[PDB]
Amino acid sequence: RQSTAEHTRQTFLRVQERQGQSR
Amino acid sequence: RDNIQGITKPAIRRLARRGGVKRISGLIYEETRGVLKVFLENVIRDAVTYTEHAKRKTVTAMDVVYALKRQGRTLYGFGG
Amino acid sequence: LRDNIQGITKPAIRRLARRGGVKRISGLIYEETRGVLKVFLENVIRDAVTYTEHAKRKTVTAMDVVYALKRQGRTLYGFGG
Amino acid sequence: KRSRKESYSVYVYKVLKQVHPDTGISSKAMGIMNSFVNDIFERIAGEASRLAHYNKRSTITSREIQTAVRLLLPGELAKHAVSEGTKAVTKYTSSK
Amino acid sequence: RSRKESYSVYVYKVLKQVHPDTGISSKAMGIMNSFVNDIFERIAGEASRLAHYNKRSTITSREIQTAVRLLLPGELAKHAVSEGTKAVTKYTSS
Amino acid sequence: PHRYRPGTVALREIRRYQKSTELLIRKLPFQRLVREIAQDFKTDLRFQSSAVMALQEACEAYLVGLFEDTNLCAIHAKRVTIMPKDIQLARRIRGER
Amino acid sequence: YRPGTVALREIRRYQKSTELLIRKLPFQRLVREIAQDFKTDLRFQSSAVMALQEACEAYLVGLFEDTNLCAIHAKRVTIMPKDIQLARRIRGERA
Amino acid sequence: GVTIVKPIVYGNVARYFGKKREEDGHTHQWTVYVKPYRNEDMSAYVKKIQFKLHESYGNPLRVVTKPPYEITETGWGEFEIIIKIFFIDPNERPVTL
Amino acid sequence: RAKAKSRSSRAGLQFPVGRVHRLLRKGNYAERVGAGAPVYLAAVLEYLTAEILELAGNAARDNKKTRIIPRHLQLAIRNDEELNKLLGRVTIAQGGVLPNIQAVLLPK
Amino acid sequence: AKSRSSRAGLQFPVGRVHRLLRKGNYAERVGAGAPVYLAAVLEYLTAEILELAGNAARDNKKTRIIPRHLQLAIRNDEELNKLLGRVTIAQGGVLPNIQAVLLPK
Amino acid sequence: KRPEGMHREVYALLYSDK
Amino acid sequence: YKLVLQDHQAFRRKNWRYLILDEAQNIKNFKSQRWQSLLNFNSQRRLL
DNA sequence: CAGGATGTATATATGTGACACGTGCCTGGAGACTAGGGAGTAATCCCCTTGGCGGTTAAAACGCGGGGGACAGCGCGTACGTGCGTTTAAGCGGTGCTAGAGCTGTCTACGACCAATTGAGCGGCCTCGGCACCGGG
DNA sequence: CCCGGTGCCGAGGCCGCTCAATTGGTCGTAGACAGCTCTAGCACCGCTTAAACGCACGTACGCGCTGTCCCCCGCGTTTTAACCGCCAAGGGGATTACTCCCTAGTCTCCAGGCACGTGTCACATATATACATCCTG
């Protein structure tokens, strides 16, 4: 969904993938 | 009564830890007690002023929230 | 316009500091003060132009500035009629 | 075709002259004074409206205004303003 | 009992839309409801002030838009304005 | 025996209490203080259980912010330790004084 | 004169008057500069510009009054940039 | 397959003081500039323009951040100035003149 | 009809009770306003104005001036304890500041 | 038959927002699009905060938004921080941060 | 029991904020 | 019984072959927290 | 322990800006006088949420010891202040021009308003599973 | 700090009823838009000059270092009360009855808000000696 522009969408997906990879 | 000493040295030290301090002076506790007492006195005065107009015998978290909003310290969690 | 922040010179900033009580001033304090004044004017004038555009007006009146300052917390008397 | 704007200068000068016969006031001071009156009017009226909305009442009354003044004015100014308002509300309802 | 009321259902629906699997506790739900109420109060007060400034006896979508502009910081304002305008345009077409 | 150097346990306490989310002030003493303060404003006023918790939350948040600003002011003076003058300067800049 | 006497003189002089300390013609151009970034061909009233200048001067006076205490806190007489930075941070403008 | 052409003009004006200055020996004022050929706002795509002067000045590397980009200065001799125009997009190579 | 008496004169105030009531009733404040609210509001405003005017006139006489200028307002506000708290977040144009020089920056 | 929320494509209660606006003494006439716009802005902000708090709680091995992670999101997002600057989230805690001067080495 | 006995507005002002 | 109530979790997390209860007249009330906690324990055999 | 040498008051004056004061206008207000509406005061009364009893351990507190941090003294260096000379654009107020904020006049779609119908939301209840708690690595 | 086990009460989903949201229908009024205008904002140019810019010089303030003295910090043991459950009953809230206060409308009328000209009425700017008020000797 549209929450905010580039600096938020991509950074947010990256933060989401962070712990997914760490697991 | 004079039960202001309920906010003791260990409690003030834990508050300082949470605030990020790693070393406290010897005269910080008596100053923090007075600052907290003034802040309380103000918030409780506003709460009691709301309660008197509300004609309620019990002070409410809603009155506390209104007092905090008046003082500018908006608080979330208690229905406001 | 451009680079009009430099229209706030060292004598002006030093008088503003004298009026605030400062006795001795450093060198980079002038740049810091220019940068802070510019950031403040940015927000104030953004609020003023937001109050203006919404009114379909081409002139920024004094009431718009007053309302902007009230929003920013700097209630200003003497320009409210 | 006149665009007349209102103000409190006619009464701010009456009070000024009654509390200080020999002292005047400039136009800029009168404007700042009217601004102060407007600001405090807005503050007190908004506080009374907030009290009414909290008490679930659609009308503001003298009691809401009194509690709003008590909340707004600090310390030994609150009491003075409240005594003045109370005395005025009692001298007004007595048909004098 | 009375009927205290809250946006809990809609908050939960938006939570499901953003994170289909991430739930929320009761304390968090109450905090979100309080936040929504406070933002509503602030935006409505700013819109009423704008209406009083413009001498308009009505609070319109344009007033709400300007109130959101006067409150949200930058990108947040630009996104909320787009959302509001799109919502109103889609509403006007039905 | 074994004792840590000054500065090792303070950092542990900081790292612990900065992630832990629980009221640090003692509940019953804070309640007694609230009752004392309300006694000087109105006699025989009752308080809801949630009102005292809200007051404690607000006071703890205010004190946490005050201590943050105090530590900032202390570090500004090249001092790792805080002192009442730091709280004074913090409040002065905040505008509370 | 000794460094500091003519400065305390100016302190006592400018804490006595009320005239504007920033020059009009240079400050109005800065105001129009900052307004250009929001609206092209924007008109301003003289009263509006004077109110803006008054607000700016009051804000800067308060900022320097806080910076003076921030500097004195470090046993320093000269205000350095970190002083204004701490002032702003504790005010909440660049926290 | 997208090619965008932006016309610009870069140069310098100079005014002769009529006599050599005693303070620094300079004889001319000069303003070095980049401006657009069209009536367009360069700031929409230019982040900054850096002007590198001769090493005689206290700082040779000057910077400007708003169009029409220009610097006013004083001097007595001619020298080559390197103007480096940076674009808002960091992935675009800045232009050198 | 009988000779019309104004509400301001009836109460004993100078500020316009009629205009205060008009603002209160047409404003965001509430749906309808009681007769006692605007009287109280105008009385409070008049009291604040009288107080600040007394202080400003005192400052003016101290400065040897017959006309109250924004200097006499700023000085009065920042010298009074309670009015300062009331108008802490309010700036006054051409009002100036107080000669509050820190004791640490004085000749030694 | 059709709720204005679904008509405009929103999840928030456009009708409840309109009722609250017309009953809150904000104005004497609430525009047709004013409540839709307000509900849309509220839904946008709610979605932002909920997404941030969700992926902040899921970053800690949890599957349920809590006040701690709500506070973490509100204080890490620069826009939401400026928005809720003077607001305090109960049981939210503070951000982990130790000054370099206090830190050893 | 409420003493009152006076005007509604004045009575409320005097007692409701003792 | 008191310590069993205090640490029912620790005891409940342990699988017991036999659960012996001396003077079983102390759990004669089914509405007792003691009775509930002792019933919520994992035991293969029970001896009162 | 002085004295040129500045700077800062203190007092007096006057005439041009500005309060100050009629003179009539009127139109937006301010109040008086009937008629109608309505919400909150007041009295009960059922029902939860306080305030009040006795134990349990967990945290507050008291002490100790030495260690690292505050505060004072001192000195090196440099930069920030003050003065002089050169330079520049800021203040003034005089003239020219038109752009649009504002007043105004007309016609109209939108919303408050009122009545009837319908389902979205919310109290309530129960089943269940995400994370609180915990002891070994 | 991370990991596997147990466990429980609070999260989340279902039931059902009702009251707010919705559908349909009317009046009117604030507003949208075009017409006109006259003020004020804009541009420009020259005489005056006060303020700004640049540079020299040294004096005093930042700042770095060192040393003492102690005042907090970590750890152990000792004492207080915060905390977790029951039991009356005191209040916070439902339910009903009813009146003083305000709403709404329409005339009648005192009051203030300017357009204008006239007459006073501050204190800004100017001038000078008196007083500090220095600072180099």
Author numbering:
A (entry chain J): 134 to 156
B (entry chain H): 23 to 102
C (entry chain D): 22 to 102
D (entry chain B): 27 to 122
E (entry chain F): 28 to 121
F (entry chain G): 38 to 134
G (entry chain C): 41 to 135
H (entry chain W): 18 to 114
Question: What's in the article?
Answer:
The ATP-dependent chromatin remodeler SRCAP complex (SRCAP-C) promotes the replacement of canonical histone H2A–H2B dimer with H2A.Z–H2B dimer. Here, we determined structures of human SRCAP-C bound to H2A-containing nucleosome at near-atomic resolution. SRCAP-C can be divided into motor and ARP modules, which merge at the ATPase of the SRCAP subunit. As a scaffold, the SRCAP subunit consists of an N-terminal helicase-SANT-associated (HSA) and pre-HSA helices that integrate the ARP module, an ATPase domain grasping the nucleosomal DNA, and an insert threading through the RUVBL1–RUVBL2 hexamer.
Cryo-EM 3D classification showed conformations in the apo (nucleosome-bound and nucleotide-free) and ADP-bound states in the ADP-containing sample and conformations in the apo and ADP-BeFx-bound states in the ADP-BeFx-containing sample, respectively. The open conformation of the ATPase indicates the absence of nucleotide in the active site. The ATPase in the apo form guides the motor module away from NCP, an organization distinct from those in the ADP-BeFx-bound and ADP-bound states. Despite a slight shift, YL1 and the ARP module maintain comparable nucleosome-binding modes, respectively, in the apo, ADP-bound, and ADP-BeFx-bound states. This suggests that YL1 and the ARP module maintain the association between the nucleosome and SRCAP-C, regardless of whether the ATPase is bound to nucleotide (ATP or ADP) or not. Despite the use of a high concentration of either ADP or ADP-BeFx nucleotide in the sample along with a crosslinker, the majority of the selected particles in both cases correspond to the apo state of the complex, possibly due to the following reasons. Thus, particles in the apo state may reflect dissociation and/or unsuccessful binding of nucleotides during sample preparation.
